[PDB]
Design a protein around this nucleic acid. Structure first.
Ligand SMILES: [Mg+2]
Ligand SMILES: [Mg+2]
Ligand SMILES: [Mg+2]
Ligand SMILES: [Mg+2]
Ligand SMILES: [Mg+2]
Ligand SMILES: [Mg+2]
Ligand SMILES: [Mg+2]
Ligand SMILES: [Mg+2]
Ligand SMILES: [Mg+2]
Ligand SMILES: [Mg+2]
Ligand SMILES: [Mg+2]
Ligand SMILES: [Mg+2]
Ligand SMILES: [Mg+2]
Ligand SMILES: [Mg+2]
Ligand SMILES: [Mg+2]
Ligand SMILES: [Mg+2]
Ligand SMILES: [Mg+2]
Ligand SMILES: [Mg+2]
Ligand SMILES: [Mg+2]
Lengths: 141, 180, 218, 83, 33
RNA sequence: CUUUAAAUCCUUUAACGAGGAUCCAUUGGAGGGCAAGUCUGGUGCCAGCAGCCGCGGUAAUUCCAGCUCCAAUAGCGUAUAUUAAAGUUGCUGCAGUUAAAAAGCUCGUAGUUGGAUCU
């Protein structure tokens, strides 16, 4: 069992400090490898340049073609696959455009049928996708 | 460095469960009975009562002869009796835990204007108060959430400048009289 | 019309027993549902907690039955729980109501601090177990309310408890075990020996022994 | 049991086991409430008075109700001292 | 007119797509809420 | 008019100023978790939705729309860090037969702990 002596504070504290490293989330947050590997580098959003448009096949048992864009970030130059979520919003994005990209909602984990996609497009050409979808603002042009 | 102050605090707490049928029914009953604008006004009084209960419970863990308990529970009971939620015969520290939110809701200016016959509805009372028709013993008050002290209960009236309290007729009366 | 088949039922029907506490004192098992209707009567309210489909694998395919969980109480010191499985939902609900009102226990209520007025909380900390579910009830100050999950809260309200703190451990997603554990915890209130129950017990005539001559006639 | 005013506030007062002093609950169906008759010291017939014992089911399951009843009867003088 | 029976709906669709709905209906028929 | 170094704002006051009082409240949802429609028209494993379970392959309670209905409200969604939930880091307070787990066995320094007894 555990030691219950009156002078065992050092042992208890040292053991807890050493056994906190077997927690997945504590080690992920305090090790530094995840932060280094994160393309955003800890930011909530990022800006990138749309390299191209791609279609990702939805994982089984669902069957569909999810429209995504390959983009390259401006601050570090990494390449990222982002999702354009709406019905027909892929026609609002042109190549070589500048887009704002945020996370998908699961802190770096893939969401839904889309395999290996953890980012989504928020604004394209400095206007929000919601405004374009609802017809409140037009593309600058 | 500046000569400004940054002291402020929130006056309400949101419930943990967003969609609870019983809580929604109770809060809507309170809003309908006392003519409140939204759910936040209920949560504000709930927070006030929670703070009072927390203080009372903290003072009930001390010894009866502790000087701080005797000094501060007496002040708390005096304030509660002053605002009218408590009674003189029930000035023990245990009766504070027997208070309910309706007791604090009954002391608003909006409900006291309606209960005194100045208005024919609680919503009408709120409208009258907000439109500068009600005065409290000398002063025109237009805040519905004004908490009426006991000694001020007798001193609610129409303002002297109000068309109702002997003042000049309003815009509509003057325009209609000009019409004919 | 009610025709009792046991001595206790005949005594209750013939107005020989004043209250259900007389039956509770002698720990006499209750086998007829009409006794509780005779005593508690209109004060009883019930609520269906869950309808659960279960399946048995056969050669031709699965056979499905439905299990109803029903909690009942009068909000004034008595509480009961019942579970019934049947082929049809309505039959299971009726059986669950009957079984719940059959197994009705009284609840002991105590004070948190100064003993002024009517009791409002549990006498002390009580624990109930069912499966892996552990439920702990702790006395609370007056006006606190019930701080618990939705399922135990209904049973606590039907028992008549106003204020209580609640702790729970284990897989509480099992609604049946979660309800049965808190039902056991509530039932354990009258089984706890507190210093105010240290007085020696004065025995009294049992209803079987007291009304034996009347039972001989009928 | 009772409040500060002294008024008793309980549904009922449960009876305790005579052997172990444990509380006999409302759902304890293995408990026994037994009566032992008293006889006249001169004739030996039924006096009409009796002594009441109560045993909880936990003791009965232990098989210790026989000894407990024997000791209770010896204490009350029903059983001879030189048993 | 008697149009919908919650008991039949639950007993038939308890394992179908519309189970989570019919259960939610059945409780409304039982608890009155 | 007052305010102020001079102003602005607030307060105080003349005159004008509300019936569609058009002097127009929005943000997200309506299968469950979780409050609220297997209503109607399209589409037909496509487009799409979906934090999770899942929906969509010709009668979609879940997509695109109309109506209606919910929640908070001059506020409401989204992404990320963090706290409670977590008795899933357990000092209070977790586990180690079979679900993850006790060193192959023994000796032994440091550390931890240590039987009664004195007015
Ligand atoms: Mg992993
Ligand atoms: Mg599919
Ligand atoms: Mg689970
Ligand atoms: Mg809307
Ligand atoms: Mg819709
Ligand atoms: Mg939902
Ligand atoms: Mg619902
Ligand atoms: Mg899946
Ligand atoms: Mg169709
Ligand atoms: Mg359709
Ligand atoms: Mg945490
Ligand atoms: Mg905790
Ligand atoms: Mg974790
Ligand atoms: Mg603890
Ligand atoms: Mg564990
Ligand atoms: Mg193993
Ligand atoms: Mg070994
Ligand atoms: Mg050593
Ligand atoms: Mg020693």
């Amino acid at each position: 069992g555990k030691c219950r002596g009156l002078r065992t504070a050092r042992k208890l504290r040292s053991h807890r400090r050493d056994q906190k490293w077997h927690d997945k989330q504590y080690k992920k947050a305090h090790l530094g490898t995840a932060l280094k590997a994160n393309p955003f580098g800890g930011a909530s959003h990022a800006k990138g340049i749309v390299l191209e448009k791609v279609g990702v096949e939805a994982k089984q048992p669902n069957s569909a073609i999810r429209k995504c864009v390959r983009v390259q970030l401006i601050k570090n130059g990494k390449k990222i696959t982002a999702f354009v979520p709406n019905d027909g919003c892929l026609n609002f994005i042109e190549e070589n455009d500048e887009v704002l990209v945020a996370g998908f909602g699961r802190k770096g984990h893939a969401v839904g049928d889309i395999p290996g996609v953890r980012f989504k497009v928020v604004k394209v050409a400095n206007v929000s996708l919601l405004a374009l979808y609802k017809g409140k603002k037009e593309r600058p042009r | 460095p500046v000569a400004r102050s940054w002291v402020c605090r929130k006056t309400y707490v949101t419930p943990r469960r967003p969609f609870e049928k019983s809580r929604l029914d109770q809060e809507l009953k309170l809003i309908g009975e006392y003519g409140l604008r939204n759910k936040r006004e209920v949560w504000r009084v709930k927070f006030t009562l929670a703070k009072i209960r927390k203080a009372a419970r903290e003072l009930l863990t001390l010894d009866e002869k502790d000087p701080r308990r005797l000094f501060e529970g007496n002040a708390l009971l005096r304030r509660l009796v002053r605002i009218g939620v408590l009674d003189e015969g029930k000035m023990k520290l245990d009766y504070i835990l027997g208070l309910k939110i309706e007791d604090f809701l009954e002391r608003r200016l909006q409900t006291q204007v309606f209960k005194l016959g100045l208005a024919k509805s609680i919503h009408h009372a709120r409208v009258l108060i907000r439109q500068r028709h009600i005065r409290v013993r000398k002063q025109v008050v237009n805040i519905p959430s004004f908490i009426v002290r006991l000694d001020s209960q007798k001193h609610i009236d129409f303002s002297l400048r109000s068309p109702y309290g002997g003042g000049r007729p309003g815009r509509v009366k003057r325009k209609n009289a000009k019409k004919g | 019309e009610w025709m009792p088949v046991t001595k206790l039922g005949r005594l209750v029907k013939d107005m020989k027993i004043k209250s259900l506490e007389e039956i509770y004192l002698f720990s006499l098992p209750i086998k007829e549902s009409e006794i509780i209707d005779f005593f508690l009567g209109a004060s009883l309210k019930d609520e269906v907690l869950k309808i659960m489909p279960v399946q048995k694998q056969t050669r031709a395919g699965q056979r499905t039955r439905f299990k109803a969980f029903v909690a009942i109480g009068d909000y004034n010191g008595h509480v009961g729980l019942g579970v019934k499985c049947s082929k049809e939902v309505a039959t299971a609900i009726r059986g669950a109501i009957i079984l719940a009102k059959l197994s009705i226990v009284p609840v002991r209520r105590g004070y948190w601090g100064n003993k002024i007025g009517k009791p409002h909380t549990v006498p002390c900390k009580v624990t109930g177990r069912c499966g892996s579910v552990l439920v702990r009830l702790i006395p609370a100050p007056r006006g606190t309310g019930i701080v618990s999950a939705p399922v135990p809260k209904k049973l606590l309200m039907m028992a008549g408890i106003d204020d209580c703190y609640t702790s729970a451990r284990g897989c509480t997603a099992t609604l049946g075990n979660f309800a049965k554990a808190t039902f056991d915890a509530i039932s354990k209130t009258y089984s706890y020996l507190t210093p105010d129950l240290w007085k020696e017990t004065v025995f009294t005539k049992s209803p079987y022994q007291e009304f034996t001559d009347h039972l001989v006639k009928t | 049991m009772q409040n500060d005013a002294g008024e008793f506030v309980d549904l009922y007062v449960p009876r305790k086991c005579s052997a172990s002093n444990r509380i006999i609950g409302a759902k304890d169906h293995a408990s026994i409430q037994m009566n032992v008759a008293e006889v006249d010291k001169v004739t030996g017939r039924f006096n009409g008075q009796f002594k009441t014992y109560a045993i909880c089911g936990a003791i009965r399951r232990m098989g210790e109700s026989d000894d407990s009843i024997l000791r209770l009867a010896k204490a009350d003088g029903i059983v001879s001292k030189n048993f | 007119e008697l149009g919908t029976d919650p008991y039949e709906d639950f007993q038939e669709n308890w394992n179908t797509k519309h189970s989570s709905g019919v259960t939610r209906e059945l409780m409304r028929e039982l608890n009155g809420g």
